[PDB]
Write a protein that binds this ligand. Structure first.
Ligand SMILES: [Mg+2]
Ligand SMILES: [Mg+2]
Ligand SMILES: [Mg+2]
Ligand SMILES: [Mg+2]
Ligand SMILES: [Mg+2]
Ligand SMILES: [Mg+2]
Ligand SMILES: [Mg+2]
Ligand SMILES: [Mg+2]
Ligand SMILES: [Mg+2]
Ligand SMILES: [Mg+2]
Ligand SMILES: [Mg+2]
Ligand SMILES: [Mg+2]
Ligand SMILES: [Mg+2]
Lengths: 190, 199, 109, 138, 176, 247
RNA sequence: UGGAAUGCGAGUGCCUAGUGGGCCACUUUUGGUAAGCAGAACUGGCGCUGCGGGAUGAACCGAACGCCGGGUUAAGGCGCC
RNA sequence: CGGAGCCUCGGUUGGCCUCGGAUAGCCGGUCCCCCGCCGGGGUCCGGUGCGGAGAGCCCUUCGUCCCGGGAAACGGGGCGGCCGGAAAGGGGGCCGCCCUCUCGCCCGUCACGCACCGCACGUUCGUGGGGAACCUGGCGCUAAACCAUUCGUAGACGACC
């Protein structure tokens, strides 16, 4: 049936000062600014309270499919606040059996050269979205580190190289090779 | 005496049914900016509908077959011609009275165009339902002039912004002149307020 | 020194799907699209004004090329302000979607 | 962000229907698209009425959801809606539309002979402001 | 029966004809939900022919009169016990309606059963309609209106009166 | 029923209007796309097929058996005299089509180019371009031409140049020179039109247009063979000898 | 006191053409896997019949027909054709 | 480019000279404040079934003759230079002048105008489009195509080079 009211609040930390024009939200703070346009979701955004301490999202007279769309806005706003405060440092491992996967990074995090995967002479030049920085960390042999603010762009850049390092026309249950996401965390801790 | 109709946000068949009757009733209808026409339903069903329409061709000679036009203005002409008795002389006269444009030409850019609310997307559809742009559909199915129309419309939106800025300046001059002169024209002002024009 | 007739467009005849009764004409008067609003024009005189090749006589002036077919607005039609008319001579179907003059001087005011 | 809310006690303008063009109060909410509806002073009998015809306004007088017509009338007279409604620009442009509908032909001739000079004076003053702005710019 | 327009509620009593076996048959009363009194008497004979050994020629209707709502202005919660015929078998229901009158609630019941289940009015058989307090309600669509300080906007005012301003300049506003 | 032994089809449907060509000179259907990084240059030329001979050259390709060998290959000689530029034309971009905006000819236009505008040069009085060439030695005509070029600076997107072949140096029987539009692809529209005005009434050789070891496109009309049968044209399988009504 | 209700003018004699290939439909039902198959019972249509509707249409729904004017419906519909 | 009659073809019976765009959101300003080549951002202030409303805007024609009041004095109208327009291009704006007014519009006196005696196609865009010929004057103009012949890059004949 049409549920008369569904709502969920987001308590924002004092380091962040959010605002909104219409239904598009912006989140700024220490690391940078992140925007998201909500023109597909059709809800009410109340930015109430002095010092803008909480964001409320209403849905009036919507059945189950639009009631499912209420918590996802809360989740995207909380992910954006987490990206602005802390960030998204996706650590990921290069698993191989025989051939060492040669990974190097061109243009300070914009492109990844992937070489020597199952003895293939073809190289993969996988380009990240601007905003995501790829790097090789210290004290670890096979490691790729993806830094960024937008969880969409960082995890999409992870999925690009994870689907680039795939084994074709073989048994992937035996050939356990490729670069795979290992740790999903933040840049700085809290 | 010419219905200059906008095409942005208007539904395809709901607009065409309103257009074709007024064209049969002796009114010169010019529907303009027809790439802004949006069709209800998601994009993939409308694309596969037009692709089945493209596959439906004459086997022995497709030049004799159904002429599948790719421009959005000619798709609107196709659906109005489907909603007309075009085999008859009054239907051919209706097709002569109809005049449909891609983009908006300089004969019709400096004219206040009309909007039909009985065929509009925000009026006739629920906001959670999907719609498909006819211009994007046409450029994806093989219409070559989306970016050209985009640049020309960007130029004329800049020109119309300058014109509307001049109109706002004239409206400010009118209101400030009324604010200055209201004392000596209060005799003309009060007689329209007793008849219900400025209240 | 102005217009003394209301604008009305002749749509078609009294017709079914596969039959037409061409003695009764369907008239679409501009500005009126309701049965409560079409009660004013009931009983007015209307005419299709057209001009031809040969000259015909004109009452109160020199002979001109213009010709008419006079009539009488009988009763309303439909729900959207369409109305009927019975003429003495039937209208040609050349006049489909053209202007005729409905008048005001058969008045009930 | 919404400002008007269907609340118990809100006064609303009825657009169409039998009681068209009248103020009324929301006594109780019956269904999704039907409300329990009463107007004591504006001559609208206690009835059920959908939300399509009523246009909810910015007036809320306080009475309980099951309160009867005597208490609705006392809250109406305490809130004094009939004066502020006529003071509002809403009902003023409504009665302006009513005067334009009831405009007589001789009244329309007076309107035309007023508008003619009232527009000529505006045109002269706008031309003087245009040449003055041109003189200040140059 | 055709559920034409709105329904009406009839208190229909009837009995058997006097016989040399029994001189005075007992009287049987029902609450018939029907548009008019002719189909009320017909549906009364239908239910009496279902329940007892009694037909129209072997009996009579003593009085058939419409009985009204004792509080039509109060909004109430009617729990209607349904016995309808599906396309596969026959089923029972217990369904709540928030409405003013019994006849209007049964009208809404016929409309909503034909809405959700395509149950025709000849298949739908009503056995009992009872007014119920707000505490004993079961359905959440009825219980969501149980609030003293109820408050909601009208979110998307899709405008009607569309074909009088057919050819207009301005786009219609729909935020009210 | 179906075809027993499936076979590929004789002919191509991409070329199916097999009519005599309305044009005799090979028309460019698509010019190369411009970019402002490249300087201004011609993108086409109009030569004449002279003949055929051998060639002997070294092959430099790694991996082949034919590496560092002396092969022979068939070559075409195309005599390409330098063409005379006698006009320009600008093109506005419309949503209906790439429309020619304004064509501006030159002052001194040779009789080779004058032959093309006439079907019968003998009976003609040779009076073309006479009222057009008076615009180049007066005050008002130069102002109108400068206004035309200044409008072409603003509104034209594609600038094509008008060049005709030099027929007097050729050993052909005809004297009627072929004219051709060549799209100048290069920098901005202003620099393009300035370079075209500089190259107006000038010779254009082939070293300016093309160069060594460049892969080019050849447009032209096929050698005509007349009304031919389906065996000669579509190369179908001949019916056997025993057929009554033809094989 | 024309011995129930309702309705209708009845009875009777010659001469007599054409026909004697039928088909379809709610219900019952034989043979057959089934058939726009073959064969039956009641009744109505087509044949012999136009008209409005089912886009189209020998059988379906409505309704049967002299020539016209005003009105009103049935069956069907009322975004455009 | 600058006059009269006379045939045919028809519809027509005042124009709207333009923001973009959202619909769980819009419109208009001052800008105390800050950036850019007047625009943009925040804040502030009034509306928001829209009244900086197409449920709307502009013009309004019966006419002329005298006088008085409101309105105008910086305006109506009468020939040259300079700019803006190309997607299928606007009878637009600015400077003047050798000449004419307190007539144009709004209120009141004052009469006149075939008052054609109740009777219908009346009233414009209309110097409307097309074809014939007469008029008066000025400034400009001195052509191609096809057949024939020839060629053979072509071809049944036509066509084509
Ligand atoms: Mg294998
Ligand atoms: Mg006329
Ligand atoms: Mg095969
Ligand atoms: Mg043989
Ligand atoms: Mg026989
Ligand atoms: Mg037999
Ligand atoms: Mg049978
Ligand atoms: Mg019969
Ligand atoms: Mg029949
Ligand atoms: Mg059918
Ligand atoms: Mg039947
Ligand atoms: Mg009849
Ligand atoms: Mg129909």
């Amino acid at each position: 049936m049409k549920t008369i009211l569904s709502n969920q609040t987001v308590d924002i930390p004092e380091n962040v000062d959010i605002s909104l024009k219409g239904r598009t939200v912006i989140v700024k703070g220490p690391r940078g600014t992140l925007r998201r346009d909500f023109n597909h979701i059709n809800v009410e955004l109340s930015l109430l309270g002095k010092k803008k301490k909480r964001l409320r999202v209403d849905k009036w007279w919507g059945n189950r499919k639009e009631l499912a769309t209420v918590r996802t806005i809360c989740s995207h706003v909380q992910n954006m606040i987490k990206g602005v405060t802390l960030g998204f440092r996706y650590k990921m491992r290069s698993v191989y059996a025989h051939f060492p996967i040669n990974v190097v990074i061109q243009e300070n995090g914009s492109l990844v050269e992937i070489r020597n995967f199952l003895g293939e002479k073809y190289i993969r030049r996988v380009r990240m979205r601007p905003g995501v920085a790829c790097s090789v960390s210290q004290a670890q042999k096979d490691e790729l580190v993806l830094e960024g603010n937008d969880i969409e762009l960082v995890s999409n850049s992870a999925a690009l190289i994870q689907q680039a390092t795939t084994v074709k026309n073989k048994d992937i249950r035996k050939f356990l090779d490729g670069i795979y996401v290992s740790e999903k965390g933040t840049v700085q801790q809290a | 005496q010419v219905l200059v109709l906008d095409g942005r946000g208007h539904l395809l068949g709901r607009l065409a049914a309103i257009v074709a009757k007024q064209v049969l009733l002796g009114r010169k209808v010019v529907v303009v900016r027809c790439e802004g026409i949006n069709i209800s339903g998601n994009f993939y069903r409308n694309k596969l509908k037009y692709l089945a329409f493209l596959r439906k061709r004459m086997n022995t000679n497709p030049s004799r077959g159904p002429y599948h036009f790719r421009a959005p203005s000619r798709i609107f002409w196709r659906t109005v011609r489907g909603m007309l008795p075009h085999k008859t002389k009054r239907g051919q006269a209706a097709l002569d009275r109809l005049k449909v444009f891609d983009g908006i030409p300089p004969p019709y850019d400096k004219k206040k165009r009309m909007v039909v609310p009985a065929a509009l997307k925000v009026v006739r559809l629920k906001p959670t339902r999907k719609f498909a742009y006819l211009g994007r559909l046409a450029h994806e199915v093989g219409w070559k002039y989306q970016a050209v129309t985009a640049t020309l419309e960007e130029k004329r939106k800049e020109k119309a912004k300058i014109h509307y800025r001049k109109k706002k300046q004239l409206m400010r001059l009118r209101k400030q002149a009324e604010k200055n002169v209201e004392k000596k024209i209060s005799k003309f002002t009060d007689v329209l307020k007793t008849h219900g024009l400025l209240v | 020194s102005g217009r003394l007739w209301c604008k009305a467009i002749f749509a078609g005849y009294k017709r079914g799907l596969r039959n037409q009764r061409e003695h009764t004409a369907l008239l679409k008067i501009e500005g009126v699209y309701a049965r409560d609003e079409t009660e004013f024009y009931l009983g007015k005189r209307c005419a299709y004004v057209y001009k031809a090749k040969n000259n015909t006589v004109t009452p109160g002036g020199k002979p001109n090329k213009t010709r008419v077919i006079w009539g009488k607005v009988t009763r309303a039609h439909g729900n959207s302000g369409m109305v009927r008319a019975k003429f003495r001579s039937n209208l040609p179907a050349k006049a489909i979607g053209h202007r005729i003059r409905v008048m005001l001087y058969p008045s009930r005011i | 962000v919404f400002r008007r809310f269907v609340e118990v006690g809100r006064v609303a303008y009825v657009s169409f229907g039998p009681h068209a063009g009248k103020l009324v109060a929301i006594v109780d909410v019956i269904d999704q698209n039907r409300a329990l509806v009463d107007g004591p002073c504006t001559r609208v009998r206690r009835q059920a009425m959908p939300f399509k015809c009523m246009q909810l306004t910015d007036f809320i007088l306080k009475f309980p959801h099951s309160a009867r017509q005597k208490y609705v009338r006392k809250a109406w007279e305490k809130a004094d809606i009939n004066t502020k409604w006529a003071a509002t620009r809403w009902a003023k442009k409504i009665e302006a539309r009513e005067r334009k509908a009831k405009m007589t032909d001789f009244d329309r001739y007076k309107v035309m002979k007023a508008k003619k000079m009232r527009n000529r004076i505006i045109k002269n003053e706008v031309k003087k402001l245009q040449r003055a702005a041109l003189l200040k710019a140059s | 029966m055709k559920a034409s327009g709105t329904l009406r509620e009839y208190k229909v009593v009837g009995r058997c004809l006097p016989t040399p076996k029994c001189r005075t048959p007992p009287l049987y009363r029902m609450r018939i939900f029907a548009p008019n009194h002719v189909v009320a008497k017909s549906r009364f004979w239908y239910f009496v022919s279902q329940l007892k050994k009694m037909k129209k020629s072997s009996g009579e209707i003593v009085y058939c009169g419409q009985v009204f709502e004792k509080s039509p202005l109060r909004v109430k919660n009617f729990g209607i016990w349904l016995r309808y015929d599906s396309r596969s078998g026959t089923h029972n229901m217990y369904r709540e309606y928030r409405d003013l009158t019994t006849a209007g609630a049964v009208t809404q019941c016929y409309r909503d059963m034909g809405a959700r289940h395509r149950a025709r009015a000849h298949s739908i058989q009503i056995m009992k309609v009872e007014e119920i307090a707000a505490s004993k309600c079961r359905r959440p669509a009825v219980k969501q209106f149980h609030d003293s300080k109820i408050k909601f906007p009208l979110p998307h005012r899709v405008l009607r009166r569309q074909h009088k301003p057919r050819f207009t300049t301005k786009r219609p506003n729909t935020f009210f | 029923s179906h075809r027993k032994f499936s076979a590929p089809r004789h002919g191509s449907l991409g070329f199916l209007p097999r009519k005599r060509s309305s044009r005799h000179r090979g028309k460019v259907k698509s010019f190369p796309k411009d970019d402002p990084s490249k300087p201004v240059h011609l993108t086409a030329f109009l030569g004449y097929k002279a003949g055929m001979t051998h060639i002997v050259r070294e092959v430099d390709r790694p991996g082949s058996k034919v590496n560092k060998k002396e092969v022979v290959e068939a070559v075409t000689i195309v005599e390409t005299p330098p063409m005379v530029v006698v006009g320009i034309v600008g093109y506005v971009e419309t949503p209906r089509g790439l429309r020619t905006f304004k064509t501006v000819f030159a002052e001194h236009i040779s009789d080779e180019c004058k032959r093309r505008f006439y079907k019968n040069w003998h009976k003609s009085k040779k009076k073309a371009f006479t009222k057009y060439c008076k615009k180049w030695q007066d005050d008002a005509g130069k102002r109108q031409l400068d206004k035309d070029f200044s409008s072409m600076k603003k509104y034209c997107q594609v600038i094509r140049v008008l060049a005709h072949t030099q027929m007097r140096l050729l050993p052909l029987r005809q004297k009627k020179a072929h004219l051709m539009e060549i799209q100048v692809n290069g920098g901005t529209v202003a620099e393009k039109l300035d370079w075209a005005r500089e190259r107006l009434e000038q010779q254009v050789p082939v070293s300016q247009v093309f160069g060594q070891d460049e892969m080019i496109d050849v447009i032209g009309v096929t050698k005509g063979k007349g009304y031919k049968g389906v065996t000669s044209r579509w190369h179908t399988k001949k019916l056997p000898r025993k057929t009554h009504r033809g094989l």
